[PDB]
Enzyme design. Structure first.
Site, short mmCIF file in Angstrom:
data_model
loop_
_atom_site.label_atom_id
_atom_site.label_comp_id
_atom_site.label_asym_id
_atom_site.label_seq_id
_atom_site.Cartn_x
_atom_site.Cartn_y
_atom_site.Cartn_z
N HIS C 61 0.82 -1.22 0.00
CA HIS C 61 0.00 0.00 0.00
C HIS C 61 0.85 1.26 0.00
N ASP C 91 8.52 21.51 -26.08
CA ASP C 91 8.74 20.15 -25.60
C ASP C 91 9.67 20.27 -24.40
N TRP C 126 7.02 0.77 5.25
CA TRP C 126 7.51 1.67 4.21
C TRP C 126 8.98 2.01 4.43
N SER C 156 14.35 6.88 -12.18
CA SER C 156 13.34 7.54 -13.01
C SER C 156 13.01 8.93 -12.49
N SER C 157 12.90 9.08 -11.17
CA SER C 157 12.61 10.38 -10.58
C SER C 157 13.78 11.34 -10.73
N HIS C 240 12.07 13.21 4.62
CA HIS C 240 11.29 14.44 4.74
C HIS C 240 11.44 15.37 3.53
N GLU C 242 11.48 14.05 0.62
CA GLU C 242 10.49 13.33 -0.18
C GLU C 242 9.06 13.64 0.26
N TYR C 244 8.15 16.65 1.34
CA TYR C 244 7.80 17.91 0.71
C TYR C 244 7.78 17.82 -0.82
N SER C 255 -2.87 26.36 -5.73
CA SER C 255 -2.76 27.79 -5.99
C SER C 255 -3.37 28.16 -7.34
N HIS C 290 13.28 14.95 13.34
CA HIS C 290 11.96 14.88 13.95
C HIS C 290 11.32 13.52 13.78
N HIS C 291 11.78 12.72 12.82
CA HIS C 291 11.35 11.33 12.75
C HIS C 291 12.05 10.45 13.77
N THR C 316 4.67 27.55 5.73
CA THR C 316 3.43 26.88 5.34
C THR C 316 2.22 27.68 5.79
N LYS C 319 1.86 30.45 3.41
CA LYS C 319 1.19 30.00 2.19
C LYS C 319 -0.32 29.87 2.37
N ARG C 438 0.85 1.62 15.52
CA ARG C 438 0.65 1.35 14.11
C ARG C 438 1.12 -0.06 13.76
C1 HEA Z 1 2.93 15.67 2.71
C2 HEA Z 1 3.09 14.96 3.80
C3 HEA Z 1 3.44 15.64 5.06
C4 HEA Z 1 3.48 17.03 5.47
C5 HEA Z 1 3.18 18.42 4.96
C6 HEA Z 1 3.98 16.93 6.85
C7 HEA Z 1 4.14 18.06 7.59
C8 HEA Z 1 4.59 18.10 8.87
N1 HEA Z 1 4.95 16.99 9.59
FE1 HEA Z 1 4.92 15.11 9.01
N2 HEA Z 1 4.90 13.23 8.42
C9 HEA Z 1 4.52 12.74 7.21
C10 HEA Z 1 4.07 13.49 6.16
C11 HEA Z 1 3.94 14.85 6.20
N3 HEA Z 1 4.25 15.66 7.25
C12 HEA Z 1 4.64 11.27 7.14
C13 HEA Z 1 4.27 10.58 5.86
C14 HEA Z 1 5.16 10.85 8.44
C15 HEA Z 1 5.47 9.49 9.02
C16 HEA Z 1 6.34 8.57 8.19
C17 HEA Z 1 6.28 7.22 8.86
O1 HEA Z 1 5.20 6.59 8.83
O2 HEA Z 1 7.29 6.79 9.45
C18 HEA Z 1 5.27 12.15 9.14
C19 HEA Z 1 5.72 12.16 10.42
C20 HEA Z 1 5.88 13.28 11.17
C21 HEA Z 1 6.38 13.16 12.56
C22 HEA Z 1 6.80 11.93 13.30
C23 HEA Z 1 5.78 11.42 14.29
C24 HEA Z 1 6.27 10.06 14.70
O3 HEA Z 1 6.50 9.22 13.80
O4 HEA Z 1 6.44 9.82 15.91
C25 HEA Z 1 6.39 14.55 12.96
C26 HEA Z 1 6.81 15.15 14.25
O5 HEA Z 1 7.67 16.01 14.29
C27 HEA Z 1 5.92 15.35 11.82
C28 HEA Z 1 5.79 16.71 11.85
C29 HEA Z 1 5.34 17.45 10.80
C30 HEA Z 1 5.23 18.92 10.90
C31 HEA Z 1 5.62 19.59 12.17
C32 HEA Z 1 4.73 19.37 9.63
C33 HEA Z 1 4.43 20.74 9.12
O6 HEA Z 1 5.09 21.01 7.87
C34 HEA Z 1 2.94 21.05 9.02
C35 HEA Z 1 2.70 22.53 8.73
C36 HEA Z 1 1.35 22.67 8.07
C37 HEA Z 1 0.49 23.67 8.32
C38 HEA Z 1 -0.82 23.69 7.58
C39 HEA Z 1 0.84 24.76 9.30
C40 HEA Z 1 -0.42 25.35 9.93
C41 HEA Z 1 -0.23 26.84 10.13
C42 HEA Z 1 -1.23 27.74 10.05
C43 HEA Z 1 -2.62 27.30 9.73
C44 HEA Z 1 -0.97 29.21 10.26
C45 HEA Z 1 -1.17 29.64 11.71
C46 HEA Z 1 0.01 29.23 12.56
C47 HEA Z 1 0.38 29.90 13.66
C48 HEA Z 1 -0.39 31.10 14.13
C49 HEA Z 1 1.57 29.40 14.41
N4 HEA Z 1 5.61 14.55 10.76
C1 HEA Z 2 0.36 8.06 -0.78
C2 HEA Z 2 0.31 7.92 0.53
C3 HEA Z 2 -0.86 7.27 1.16
C4 HEA Z 2 -2.26 7.33 0.85
C5 HEA Z 2 -3.14 8.04 -0.14
C6 HEA Z 2 -2.88 6.44 1.85
C7 HEA Z 2 -4.22 6.25 1.89
C8 HEA Z 2 -4.88 5.45 2.78
N1 HEA Z 2 -4.27 4.75 3.78
FE1 HEA Z 2 -2.34 4.67 4.18
N2 HEA Z 2 -0.41 4.61 4.59
C9 HEA Z 2 0.59 5.25 3.94
C10 HEA Z 2 0.46 6.08 2.88
C11 HEA Z 2 -0.75 6.37 2.31
N3 HEA Z 2 -1.96 5.90 2.70
C12 HEA Z 2 1.91 4.95 4.54
C13 HEA Z 2 3.11 5.61 3.93
C14 HEA Z 2 1.67 4.05 5.64
C15 HEA Z 2 2.64 3.42 6.61
C16 HEA Z 2 3.35 2.23 5.98
C17 HEA Z 2 4.21 1.57 7.02
O1 HEA Z 2 3.65 0.91 7.91
O2 HEA Z 2 5.45 1.69 6.95
C18 HEA Z 2 0.20 3.91 5.58
C19 HEA Z 2 -0.42 3.11 6.48
C20 HEA Z 2 -1.76 2.90 6.52
C21 HEA Z 2 -2.30 2.01 7.56
C22 HEA Z 2 -1.49 1.30 8.62
C23 HEA Z 2 -1.86 -0.15 8.86
C24 HEA Z 2 -1.68 -0.43 10.33
O3 HEA Z 2 -1.25 0.48 11.07
O4 HEA Z 2 -1.97 -1.56 10.77
C25 HEA Z 2 -3.72 2.08 7.24
C26 HEA Z 2 -4.89 1.46 7.88
O5 HEA Z 2 -5.68 2.17 8.47
C27 HEA Z 2 -3.88 2.98 6.09
C28 HEA Z 2 -5.08 3.26 5.53
C29 HEA Z 2 -5.24 4.09 4.46
C30 HEA Z 2 -6.58 4.35 3.90
C31 HEA Z 2 -7.77 3.70 4.53
C32 HEA Z 2 -6.36 5.25 2.79
C33 HEA Z 2 -7.31 5.89 1.84
O6 HEA Z 2 -7.13 7.30 1.70
C34 HEA Z 2 -7.30 5.20 0.48
C35 HEA Z 2 -8.28 5.92 -0.44
C36 HEA Z 2 -7.49 6.64 -1.51
C37 HEA Z 2 -7.90 6.71 -2.78
C38 HEA Z 2 -9.19 6.07 -3.20
C39 HEA Z 2 -7.03 7.45 -3.77
C40 HEA Z 2 -7.81 7.95 -4.98
C41 HEA Z 2 -7.45 7.11 -6.18
C42 HEA Z 2 -8.09 7.22 -7.35
C43 HEA Z 2 -9.20 8.20 -7.53
C44 HEA Z 2 -7.67 6.35 -8.51
C45 HEA Z 2 -6.61 7.08 -9.31
C46 HEA Z 2 -7.23 7.69 -10.55
C47 HEA Z 2 -7.25 9.02 -10.74
C48 HEA Z 2 -6.65 9.96 -9.74
C49 HEA Z 2 -7.88 9.57 -11.99
N4 HEA Z 2 -2.68 3.45 5.68
CU LIG Z 3 10.00 14.54 8.31
#
Ligand code: HEA
Ligand code: HEA
Ligand SMILES: [Cu+2]
Ligand SMILES: CCCCCCCCCCCCCCCCCC(=O)OCC(COC(=O)CCCCCCCCCCCCCCCCC)OC(=O)CCCCCCCCCCCCCCCCC
Ligand SMILES: CCCCCCCCCCCCCCCCCC(=O)OC[C@H](COP(=O)(O)OCCN)OC(=O)CCCCCCCCCCCCCCCCC
Ligand SMILES: CCCCCCCCCCCCCCCCCC(=O)OC[C@H](COP(=O)(O)OCCN)OC(=O)CCCCCCCCCCCCCCCCC
Ligand SMILES: CCCCCCCCCCCCCCCCCC(=O)OC[C@H](COP(=O)(O)OCCN)OC(=O)CCCCCCCCCCCCCCCCC
Ligand SMILES: CCCCCCCCCCCCCCCCCC(=O)OC[C@H](COP(=O)(O)OCCN)OC(=O)CCCCCCCCCCCCCCCCC
Ligand SMILES: CCCCCCCCCCCCCCCCCC(=O)OC[C@H](COP(=O)(O)OCCN)OC(=O)CCCCCCCCCCCCCCCCC
Ligand code: CUA
Ligand SMILES: [Mg+2]
Ligand code: NA
Ligand SMILES: [Zn+2]
Lengths: 104, 227, 514, 46, 49, 144, 72, 43, 47
Positions: C61, C91, C126, C156-157, C240, C242, C244, C255, C290-291, C316, C319, C438
């Site tokens: 998944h 192109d 993952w 590829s990326s 991290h 990746e 962003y 936007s 932070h991870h 953020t 933005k 998890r």
């Molecule tokens: C696109 C995906 C995405 C994005 C944007 C972020 C954004 C952020 N992530 Fe996260 N993060 C993940 C994807 C993402 N993360 C994933 C996939 C993992 C776990 C991987 C794994 O399973 O091991 C993870 C894990 C993760 C952890 C680890 C938790 C743990 O595993 O124990 C932490 C903690 O520091 C963290 C922090 C943050 C923070 C602080 C931001 C910030 O960038 C968020 C900021 C966003 C905002 C929208 C700001 C809101 C602000 C306003 C609305 C303005 C007002 C504010 C003030 C007045 C102060 N992330």
């Molecule tokens: C791309 C990142 C991504 C996305 C979208 C999702 C989406 C979802 N994830 Fe996922 N998830 C992860 C990334 C993601 N997850 C990661 C990184 C982990 C941790 C792995 C690890 O353990 O290491 C995780 C773990 C994870 C668990 C952990 C299992 C456990 O802890 O035991 C679970 C179960 O609840 C879960 C559930 C779901 C569900 C219910 C959705 C739903 O949102 C699914 C529905 C989404 C869609 C339906 C997408 C739309 C698609 C289309 C419309 C078709 C495409 C066609 C066009 C766009 C035209 N996710």
């Molecule tokens: Cu990170």
């Protein structure tokens, strides 16, 4: 900025005799984007510019862009039409409430 | 130790994690305030009737837009570092307990004096005593005292485990070749539960950690009468 | 002829269409995998017996819909469809290398499926944390195929990122400077820069892991002087950035959607948006620990990393405030792309703010590897980038194909998808706060009810994706072409017609003399 | 010269609606049903 | 001109609303699944050894 | 009948309040009665009546601004077919509960729930606010 | 009779001014609602719990039944 | 984006059988696998 | 200049601007950028 020179350059822009429908069209399109319901002297200038090359339809559209810019409060357009009324009975133009364009 | 329809944190015994609750409530204030603010703006300014599509000014709002999130994040971060620099103080370790995470089970070592170690397995579902729990019961519990700063020194053999109890606010990863030191203080006796918080294979969902904490006279009567 | 078009392709539009097809295929694959994962957590049981196969499903998944849905669709499809069309280039600068990146993607998919196929299975999450991924806990050929899948996806990326950077910087009209391009072009600029400055660490780490598994080295075996926290450091130093990558072209699409249907000729604070996005792309590299707030780092390191995490939190917020101020008094038209955009803003905001809650190391001590983390990132990824990609696809589907989707069916799809994904990912906040870890196939009884609720919410999202195929079938069941496009002057991509011909910009754009 | 137009920039056949419905449902159903076959094969193997 | 919406909006609110509430009270009550309800208040605890 | 392939390149009609005066007329080809209408436009305005005014507005541009922004009722159909499809999802839950799942674990039985609740209250499971804070230990009944 | 001149320059600005005042007061109201509902009730629960608390009587109350493995 | 009307019309009945065909084609292999796992566990 | 009777014309019509106004230019009379006022005439005599 201040509003007097703003309104002065707008009524200078519309009242020139070498206007065409494309020029006043783009002027009204760039005037409608302001956060401002335009003052009736601007509407006199726009109406005379629209009159100078024989268009009913754009003038009625001027009247209804004064209409929909009023928002929920509708105390704007009675004052606007009481400030526009001499041009209304010397031009033969019609308010959108009277020729059947307000109704769906 | 969970209960059905629990929305908040697991309730407090350690002072460290009740201060974590106080900070958690403060940052919950912050997220509620700004989420309600953006919700009010979204439900507000999408529900207008007027238009304004001019080339508006740009550089007239950035001073508040820069300093105000910084002010909110610094009042977030001051209790963060305040309590972060309080879990690593001058230790007074009345007891040292080692644990080492075996292949889908645990082991615990009490060898400060009069060497004692045991391996904690899991009670199966079909072997359950009536009234007990599912996926949270262990035959050989981990016995600790109260009101005392106690250290856990954790390690493992091959795979990365994680010794974790949320009610006491402890979670550290058991890594081979690296023992980690985590302090613990308890103010109540009882049985406090936790689970593995790092993946370790084909039975990762099947190791619980249970902490029975008792007064000290039962430690002489227990550790003197265990081996 | 067919092979010389759809297998030997050397224009970006056909290659991008093929990314749309492959990304849709991988999206349905990962959707099915999520259906399984939520399918036995509705009722507590070993429906699949051992949870090794459950970890295989979870890893599949994560991998297929990170590297095979979101990156191909987003980066490849929308870059190859839009970046030459916005900037005026006919192109890409290196089209054959872009085609090699695209055609390298299905062998990576095939090797990931074959990695799931072998009887040991690559059930290691993952992150590929050794020596669970070593040759003693995962003694088999599966995780080697997973590593080679990551090699092919990373290569590829990297090739796509090279082509993107050189076609933004070099394939631009001469008197246009860097600060007149639309913001999606800036998004893929910083995105491709972070791909090329992140993926070599991932490639080196997984080459190191392959050498540890096979060639008897000890980079990650502590019995010969290694340390697994070196892999954690390298992996999240990739990861991290990746993260962003996964969020920033979503910001660009959002936007463009927000400034398009609101009637704005210009998004508010363009230089502020560009500064915020470069600030995110500059601060993404110093935040990765932070991870690893539960691994055993020094306390000064943890304090520095949570401070830098709030410093990456501020732009953020800049933005999202500039989004709410580029909605300022606009002629809003309720196309479904705005519904996706409003859902993006609110739900990405709440997911990111729960991320800020997770950012502080003292609370992340107790809230690590729980469903609070899953709720944070499943909000942000699973509906921020998801609603950004449906906003982009629904918006540009007349440009991509020629026919239009039904507005009633698309708004119904937004409603069913909104209810489904919110019901899926709301109660796991309370699950993670209660202390549910998890990667669990079965849970104690007290975590049952929210689990059950979330599971049936996943089925609701399943119904949503069905309507997706139906409404795109409805386009080809109607063949309804376009009259014209509104706001065509400020967007070059709409201005060659719906759909554009094979050879656009035969004679390129004319620039203002100044 | 290549052929350009609505539906002619797609690899699949566009002009027949019902065979398009059949090919899209078997393509997306094969994509949906692949992990079910994978997990049943590891259930059969172990 | 009478569109689809001008009466079919009320028609699909009536049909879809009553169908959704009927099948969801059917799947919430009439099956016999275990929701793991909270034992607070009304149920009694029985002594175990 | 078929317009030339450069239809996107030509200036096209558009009706919105952001752009209230589009650059091209709605009806580009004018009939002979409309040619007489245009020369009557060239003459004075005050001798011209209401019905050819409204047909003049309808042939110059498409529709008026007061009724193009009226409340169309598609949100009703959208939410109706929405809850229709949540209902079909519930039917999927009926089938998948009847056929796919096996029995629940034996800990979900009412007697087992009673003994484990007594165990939770006996060992004071999170007894400050969480679970055991609603049970009186004097009267031995839940708090009221 | 005669209608006076109404407000005509920048009414959306006045609308957003009074509404950002309303947004600030409703954000403070939401924060104070969560405050008065949860936070000092939780700290009051801790204060009422701990001051009339001792470990020995509580330990005896648990170990009458025999839940503990260190006392028989 | 303003759209021209449909060159090929689509009535209610072919839309209904299309969505029915899509849901049964998506659910018959998934429901075939999930309808019986006692045979796949060799029990 | 042009080789066909149709060309892209972009107008960065005021200095230090975000958006380039894109529009098609056709053979014939010169029409302006639709928001500023810079004229543009196409001459299709460049092969
Ligand atoms: C696109 C995906 C995405 C994005 C944007 C972020 C954004 C952020 N992530 Fe996260 N993060 C993940 C994807 C993402 N993360 C994933 C996939 C993992 C776990 C991987 C794994 O399973 O091991 C993870 C894990 C993760 C952890 C680890 C938790 C743990 O595993 O124990 C932490 C903690 O520091 C963290 C922090 C943050 C923070 C602080 C931001 C910030 O960038 C968020 C900021 C966003 C905002 C929208 C700001 C809101 C602000 C306003 C609305 C303005 C007002 C504010 C003030 C007045 C102060 N992330
Ligand atoms: C791309 C990142 C991504 C996305 C979208 C999702 C989406 C979802 N994830 Fe996922 N998830 C992860 C990334 C993601 N997850 C990661 C990184 C982990 C941790 C792995 C690890 O353990 O290491 C995780 C773990 C994870 C668990 C952990 C299992 C456990 O802890 O035991 C679970 C179960 O609840 C879960 C559930 C779901 C569900 C219910 C959705 C739903 O949102 C699914 C529905 C989404 C869609 C339906 C997408 C739309 C698609 C289309 C419309 C078709 C495409 C066609 C066009 C766009 C035209 N996710
Ligand atoms: Cu990170
Ligand atoms: C040319 C004349 C017809 C030639 C024969 C066509 C039929 C067989 C074939 O060669 O078929 C061709 C192949 C194409 O596959 C490939 O080329 C390989 C891709 C990997 O078709 C497939 O495999 C299945 C595709 C089905 C339709 C998918 C629709 C996806 C909708 C969502 C995305 C929209 C994007 C809009 C943009
Ligand atoms: C949307 C709001 C922002 C997202 C918040 C996500 C985290 C969350 O909901 O945490 C649960 C929070 C605290 O739970 P609490 O009320 O303290 O539970 C014990 C006492 N009843 O409780 C709540 O937030 C209240 C319940 C959810 C309201 C929405
Ligand atoms: C009192 C001290 C205090 O902390 O008050 C809380 C709040 C201002 O404190 P501050 O931390 O700045 O804001 C909350 C952050 N989420 O202050 C308030 O919430 C104001 C409380 C008094 C006024 C309440 C008005 C309610 C109207 C309905
Ligand atoms: C492993 C396979 C590497 C393939 C490769 O790098 O090929 C060279 C690549 C393609 O050549 P290219 O410039 O795209 O040709 C078409 C336009 N001249 O050449 C290029 O894209 C230009 C040089 C890039 C070097 C990348 C090396 C990888
Ligand atoms: C639980 C989630 C349910 C989601 C349901 C979403 C339905 C969306 C329907 C919609 O947006 O219809 C458009 C319509 C405005 O269109 P019209 O009536 O022509 O304009 C009048 C001026 N307001 O009506 C609206 O724009 C009103 C509904 C707005 C919903 C915004 C949700 C953002 C997230
Ligand atoms: C049930 C699924 C099949 C419904 C068939 C049907 O009644 O089709 C008629 C109508 C076609 O859609 P129509 O309203 O013409 O277009 C919306 C304008 N954008 O269909 C619809 O509008 C969808 C009706 C769904 C009712 C549930
Ligand atoms: Cu030990 Cu997971
Ligand atoms: Mg961990
Ligand atoms: Na399960
Ligand atoms: Zn210009």
């Amino acid at each position: 900025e201040t509003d007097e020179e703003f309104d002065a350059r707008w009524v200078t822009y519309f009242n020139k005799p070498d206007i065409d429908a494309w020029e006043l069209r783009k002027g009204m399109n760039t005037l409608v984007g302001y956060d401002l319901v335009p003052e009736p002297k601007i509407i006199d200038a726009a109406l005379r510019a629209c009159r100078r090359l024989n268009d009913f339809a754009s003038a009625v559209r001027i009247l209804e862009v004064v209409k929909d810019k009023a928002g929920p409060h509708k105390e704007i357009y009675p004052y606007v039409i009481q400030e526009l009324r001499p041009t209304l009975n010397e031009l033969g133009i019609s308010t959108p409430e009277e020729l059947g364009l307000d109704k769906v | 130790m969970a209960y059905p329809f629990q929305l908040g944190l697991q309730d407090a015994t350690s002072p460290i994690m009740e201060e974590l609750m106080n900070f958690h409530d403060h940052t919950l204030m912050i997220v509620f305030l700004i989420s309600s603010l953006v919700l009010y703006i979204i439900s507000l300014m999408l529900t207008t009737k007027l238009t304004h599509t001019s080339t508006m000014d740009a550089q007239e709002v950035e001073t508040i837009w820069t300093i105000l999130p910084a002010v909110i994040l610094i009042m977030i971060a001051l209790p963060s570092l305040r309590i972060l620099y309080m879990m690593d103080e001058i230790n007074n370790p009345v007891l040292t307990v080692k644990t080492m995470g075996h292949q889908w089970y645990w082991s615990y070592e009490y060898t400060d004096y009069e060497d004692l170690c045991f391996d904690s397995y899991m009670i199966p579902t079909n072997d359950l005593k009536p009234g007990e729990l599912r996926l949270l019961e262990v035959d050989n519990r981990v016995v600790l005292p109260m009101e005392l700063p106690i250290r856990m020194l954790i390690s493992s053999e091959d795979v990365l485990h994680s010794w974790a109890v949320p009610s006491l606010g402890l979670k550290t990863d058991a890594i081979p070749g690296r023992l980690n030191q985590a302090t613990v203080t308890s103010n109540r006796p009882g049985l406090f539960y936790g689970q593995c918080s790092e993946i370790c294979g084909s039975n990762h969902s099947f190791m619980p950690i249970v902490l029975e904490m008792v007064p000290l006279k039962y430690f002489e009567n227990w550790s003197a009468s265990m081996i | 002829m067919f092979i010389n078009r759809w297998l030997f392709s050397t224009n970006h539009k056909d290659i991008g269409t093929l990314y749309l097809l492959f990304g849709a295929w991988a999206g349905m694959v990962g959707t099915a995998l999520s259906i399984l994962i939520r399918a036995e957590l509705g009722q507590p049981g070993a429906l699949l017996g051992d949870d090794q196969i459950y970890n295989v499903i979870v890893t599949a998944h994560a991998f297929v819909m990170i590297f095979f849905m979101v990156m191909p669709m987003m980066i490849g499809g929308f870059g190859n469809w839009l970046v030459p069309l916005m900037i005026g280039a006919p192109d890409m600068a290196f089209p054959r290398m872009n085609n090699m990146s695209f055609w390298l993607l299905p062998p990576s998919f095939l090797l990931l499926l074959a990695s799931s196929m072998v009887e040991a299975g690559a059930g290691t999450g993952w992150t590929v944390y050794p020596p669970l991924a070593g040759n003693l806990a995962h003694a088999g050929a599966s995780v080697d195929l997973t590593i080679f899948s990551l090699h092919l996806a990373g290569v590829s990326s990297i090739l796509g990122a090279i082509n993107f950077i050189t076609t933004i910087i070099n394939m631009k009209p001469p008197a246009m400077t860097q600060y007149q391009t639309p913001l999606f072009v800036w998004s893929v600029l910083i995105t491709a820069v972070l791909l090329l400055l992140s993926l070599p660490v991932l490639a080196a780490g997984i080459t190191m892991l392959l050498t540890d598994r096979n060639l008897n080295t000890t980079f990650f075996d502590p019995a010969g002087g290694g340390d697994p926290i070196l892999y954690q450091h390298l992996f999240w130093f990739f990861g991290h950035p990746e993260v962003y990558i996964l969020i920033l072209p979503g910001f660009g699409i959002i936007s463009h959607v927000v400034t398009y249907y609101s009637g704005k000729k210009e998004p508010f604070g363009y230089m502020g948006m560009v500064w915020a996005m470069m600030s995110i792309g500059f601060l993404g590299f110093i935040v990765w620990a932070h991870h690893m707030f539960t691994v055993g780092l020094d306390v000064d390191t943890r304090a520095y990393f949570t401070s830098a995490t709030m410093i990456i939190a501020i732009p953020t917020g800049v933005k999202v405030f500039s989004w709410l101020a580029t909605l300022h008094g606009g002629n809003i038209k309720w196309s479904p792309a705005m519904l996706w955009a409003l859902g993006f803003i609110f739900l990405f905001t709440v997911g990111g703010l729960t991320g800020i809650v997770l950012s502080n190391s003292s609370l992340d001590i107790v809230l690590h590897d729980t469903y609070y983390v899953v709720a944070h990132f499943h909000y942000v990824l699973s509906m921020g980038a998801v609603f950004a990609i449906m906003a982009g696809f629904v918006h540009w589907f007349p440009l991509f194909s020629g026919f239009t989707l039904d507005d009633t069916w698309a708004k119904a799809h937004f409603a069913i998808m909104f209810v489904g994904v919110n019901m899926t990912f709301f109660p796991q906040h309370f699950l993670g706060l209660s202390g549910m870890p998890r990667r669990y196939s079965d849970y104690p009884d007290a975590y049952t009810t929210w689990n059950t609720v979330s599971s049936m919410g996943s089925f609701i999202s399943l119904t949503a994706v069905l309507i997706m195929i139906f409404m795109i079938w409805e386009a080809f069941a109607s063949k309804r072409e376009v009259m014209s496009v509104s706001y065509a002057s400020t967007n070059l991509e709409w201005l060659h017609g719906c759909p554009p011909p094979y050879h656009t910009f035969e004679e390129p754009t004319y620039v203002k003399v100044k | 010269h290549y052929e350009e137009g609505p539906g002619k920039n797609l690899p699949f056949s566009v002009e027949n609606k019902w065979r398009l419905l059949a090919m899209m449902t078997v393509y997306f159903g094969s994509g949906f049903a692949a992990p079910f076959f994978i997990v049943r094969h590891q259930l059969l193997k172990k | 001109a009478p569109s689809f919406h001008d009466k079919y909006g009320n028609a699909i609110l009536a049909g879809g609303a009553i169908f959704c509430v009927s099948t969801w009270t059917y799947t919430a009550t009439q099956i016999g699944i275990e929701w793991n309800m909270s034992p607070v208040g009304r149920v009694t605890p029985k002594e175990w050894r | 009948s078929v317009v030339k392939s450069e239809d996107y390149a030509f200036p096209t009609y558009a009706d919105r309040r952001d752009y209230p005066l589009p650059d091209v007329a709605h009806v580009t080809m004018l009939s002979a009665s409309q040619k007489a209408l245009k020369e009557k436009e060239k003459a004075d305005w005050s001798s011209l009546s209401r019905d050819e005014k409204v047909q003049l507005y309808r042939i110059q541009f498409n529709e008026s601004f007061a009724e193009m922004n009226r409340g169309t009722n598609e949100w009703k159909t959208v939410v109706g077919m929405a809850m229709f499809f949540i209902g079909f999802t519930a039917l999927v839950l009926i089938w998948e509960k009847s056929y796919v799942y096996g029995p629940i674990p034996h800990t979900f039985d009412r007697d087992w729930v009673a003994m484990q609740t007594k165990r939770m209250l006996d060992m004071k499971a999170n007894p400050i606010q969480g679970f055991s804070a609603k049970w009186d230990y004097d009267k031995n009944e839940w708090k009221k | 009779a005669l209608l006076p001149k109404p407000q005509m320059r920048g009414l959306l600005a006045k609308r957003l001014r009074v509404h950002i005042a309303g947004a600030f007061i409703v954000a403070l109201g939401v924060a104070a609602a969560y405050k008065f509902g949860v936070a000092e009730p939780r700290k009051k629960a801790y204060a009422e719990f701990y001051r009339n608390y001792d470990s020995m009587k509580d330990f005896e109350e648990m170990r009458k039944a025999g839940i503990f493995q260190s006392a028989k | 984006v303003s759209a021209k009307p449909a060159k090929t019309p689509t009535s209610a009945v072919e839309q209904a059988v299309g969505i029915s065909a899509i849901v049964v084609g998506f659910m018959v292999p998934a429901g075939w696998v999930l309808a019986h796992l006692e045979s796949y566990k060799k029990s | 200049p042009s080789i066909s009777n149709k060309r892209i014309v972009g107008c960065i019509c005021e200095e230090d601007n975000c958006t380039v106004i894109w529009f098609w230019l056709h053979k014939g009379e010169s029409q302006r950028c639709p928001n500023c006022g810079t004229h543009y005439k196409l001459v299709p005599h460049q092969m």
